[PDB]
Structures are given as C-alpha cells and as structure tokens.
A paper describes a structure:
The isoenzyme hGSTA1-1 is primarily expressed in the human liver but can also be found in various other human tissues.
The improvement in the catalytic activity of hGSTA1-K141H/S142H as well as its thermal stability prompt us to investigate the structure of this mutant at the atomic level using X-ray crystallography. Apart from this, the two structures have only subtle differences, with a root mean square deviation (rmsd) of 0.43 Å. The engineered amino acids are at the surface of the enzyme. The results showed that the mutant hGSTA1-K141H/S142H exhibits higher catalytic efficiency, thermal stability, and sensitivity against α-endosulfan compared to the wild-type enzyme. The double mutation K141H/S142H, according to the crystallographic analysis, results in subtle but specific changes in the protein structure, and the observed stability may be attributed to specific interactions within an amino acid network. The results demonstrate that the mutant hGSTA1-K141H/S142H depicts higher catalytic efficiency and stability than the rest of the mutants studied; the mutation S142H is likely the main contributor.
Author numbering:
A (entry chain D): 1 to 210
B (entry chain C): 1 to 211
Write the structure that this text describes.
C-alpha cells in the first residue's frame, strides 16, 4: 500500500527542495516523479491530483498534499521534528517563517537585466548581514545550546542550514562574522543523514546557473 | 501574566486581520496597540520586540511572536481550532494555505492605474471561479458536513469565511454558483462569537478605501 512518499515536481530545486532536505534529514527514502512537459502537469490536474491545480504535491500516507507548508508541517510532525509542545512549535514557526522570507527573496532574485540582478542582490546581502543572520546568531548566543529550539534537533535547524548553503552560493563571506551560525552549519552537516544528502548522487538538486 | 494577547499593528486590516478574526471567533478578548507613526515602529525595533524588525507582532503567553503564520498556528492550537491529529492538521494546512494564496492576491491588488486594477481583478475573479471556490465546494460536497475538517469548527472554517467576506467586497456574484460556500458563510457568521465580531464596534477593521 506504498511506503515511500512520492514527490511530484520538476528536476530542479524550486519549491520542493526544502522538502527534499527535511525528508533526507529524517532518513526517509522517497521517490520523485518529474514533470517534463505541459502534458505531465495537465495529467496531474485532469486526474484530480492537485487540489489547487499546482505543484509541489507529495503523495504520503494516503494523502495528496499540496502547498509547501502543509507538506512540510506534516513531515515535521510525523518525524518528531516540530518540537515537543506548542510553545516550542511557536518558536520554530517564527524562526522558519523568517527563513522562508529570506529564502523567497533568494528564489525570486532576477537574473535579467544585469543592473536589476545587481540591485536586488545588493539588497538581499544587506538583509542577510543586518536582519536575518544577526537574529539567528542572537537566538544561539542567548541559550548557548547546539540547536535552535528545545536543545534538540528540529526542522528549524534543517531549514536554517539549507539556507546557509544557499547564502554561501551567493557570497561565501556573509556568514563570516557569525561564528555560531558557522558552528551550527558544521554540526548539522555532520549528522549522518544530512551528510549523506550532501554527497554526490543524492536527490539534492543543483543550482540553476551556479 | 497579561491574560489578554496584545496585537501590535497599524489601525488597519493588513496582515493582522486574520489574527483578529481567529481570536474573536475563539472567544478570546485581546488588546491592540496601534502603530501610528515611524516613531512607534522604531520604538518596537529598538526595544528588541521584533525578531525580524517587522510587525505583525503578538504578545501572548510570555512570547513576542512575529510572522503571521507563527501567530496563527499558536492561537489555533491553544484554542483547539487546529483539528484533533496530524492528518486533520494536514488537511487544514492544505486548505488554509490555498486561502492564504488567494488572500494575498486580493491584499496586493493594485488600485492604480485603473486599467491595471481592472486587468488584475479579472485574473483574480477567474481564479476564484475556476480554481479556489470549486476546490472548497468539493470538500464540503464530498463529506456533506457542516465544517471543512473533522465535522467540527476549525481555523479553516474561520479563515475561509473571512475570505468570503473579502470576495463579496470585490464582487457579490462570485459566490452565487457555490451553494455550500454560501451556507458555510451563513453558518459561521451566525456563531455567537463571529456574529459579535461582525457587529459595528468590534475590532474588525474596515476596508482601506473607507478609512
């Protein structure tokens, strides 16, 4: 009756990559079904597989889940990565929605024309240095613990470290004045499930033009 | 301590209105502290009240919560409006993230120039009639029950009916072919907590072209 979740998306990062990270960190093997044409997406739509006619969609535990946050919230709860109580979940949600805001800026960074790419990249770097990285460094500095919330691995650590890898692709110097973020990146990357995902041949997807 | 949540935002709907709806529907009295100037927002920032230097912020249960979804998820769980288990939450989350997508289109609808307002409104109406309203009408039709999930009031019913009022403001005819959505709107609007919120004098905020 099927055990591997099935990920319906493109052979690309896009809006599915944070789900790939979370499942891989939880040690969950999954299947991917790549959209490669208009007819592939039209088939999913006509078959009634997409509640709002869009992907990402994940087949898991008998459901056809769409909307990235619905998918991620279910996976996080199922694999005990969403905190131990609703107050831990509140901190996790606050942290990861800030991460989502920065991640969306990076996802939608224009490539063309060059003067627009340059202008938007400059603003993103300002926000990374002055808003987002200080906020997360401060959480880690305030409790001195190895993880963001509850002194235990959660999805917040996984989502943040994923973002740290994208920020490194934009500008490797941006993390340099944030030693607790660098230490978190190292600690999470050394977890055996995450280290496997970082190896060649994993489902981790490459950048578009980096 | 401080039994009433405190909502920090502008005296406007914006990104705080769905929290006002949810707290009011849950029967929870709250306080508001309105940002009326740049100085107000700067004071919140320099006092360390805003994790990412932005509002909405809600003071609740000893936390200074920012990010609308963090605020709403916590309130929904605290007041037992988030279903009974992980699978019900998956359905709720699916539904309300679709609601959030349509709500965002409406929130960001331009007013100017008129031909652009008209063009993007025409796109929103086509998605309401062809994508979003059919999807929620099918949910109610499939199980035949009074509420979206679990045969019991949840945040999904509250968030959907809120959005039904905004769609009504855009075009009162868009719901006409969706009888189950109309019946849900009437049912939720007649719940005593929601009916009270719909009265003049409640914390419900007006549309911007009126304030």
């Amino acid at each position: 009756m099927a055990e591997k979740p099935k990920l319906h998306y493109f052979n690309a990062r896009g809006r599915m990559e944070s789900t790939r990270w979370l499942l891989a960190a939880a040690g969950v093997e999954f299947e991917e079904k790549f959209i490669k044409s208009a007819e592939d997406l039209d088939k999913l739509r006509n078959d009634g597989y997409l509640m709002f006619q869009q992907v990402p969609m994940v087949e898991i535990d008998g459901m056809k889940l769409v909307q990235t946050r619905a998918i991620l919230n279910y996976i996080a709860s199922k694999y005990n990565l969403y905190g131990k109580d609703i107050k831990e979940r509140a901190l996790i949600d606050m942290y990861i929605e800030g991460i989502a805001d920065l991640g969306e800026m990076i996802l939608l960074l224009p490539v063309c024309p060059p003067e627009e790419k340059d202008a938007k990249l400059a603003l993103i770097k300002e926000k990374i240095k002055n808003r987002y990285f200080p906020a997360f460094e401060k959480v880690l500095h305030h409790h001195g613990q190895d993880y963001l919330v509850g002194n235990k691995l959660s999805r917040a650590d996984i989502h943040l470290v994923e973002l740290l890898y994208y920020v490194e692709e934009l500008d490797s110097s941006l993390i340099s004045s944030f030693p607790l973020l660098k230490a978190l990146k190292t600690r999470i990357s050394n977890l055996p499930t995450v280290k496997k995902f970082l190896q060649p041949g994993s489902p981790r997807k490459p950048p578009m033009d980096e």
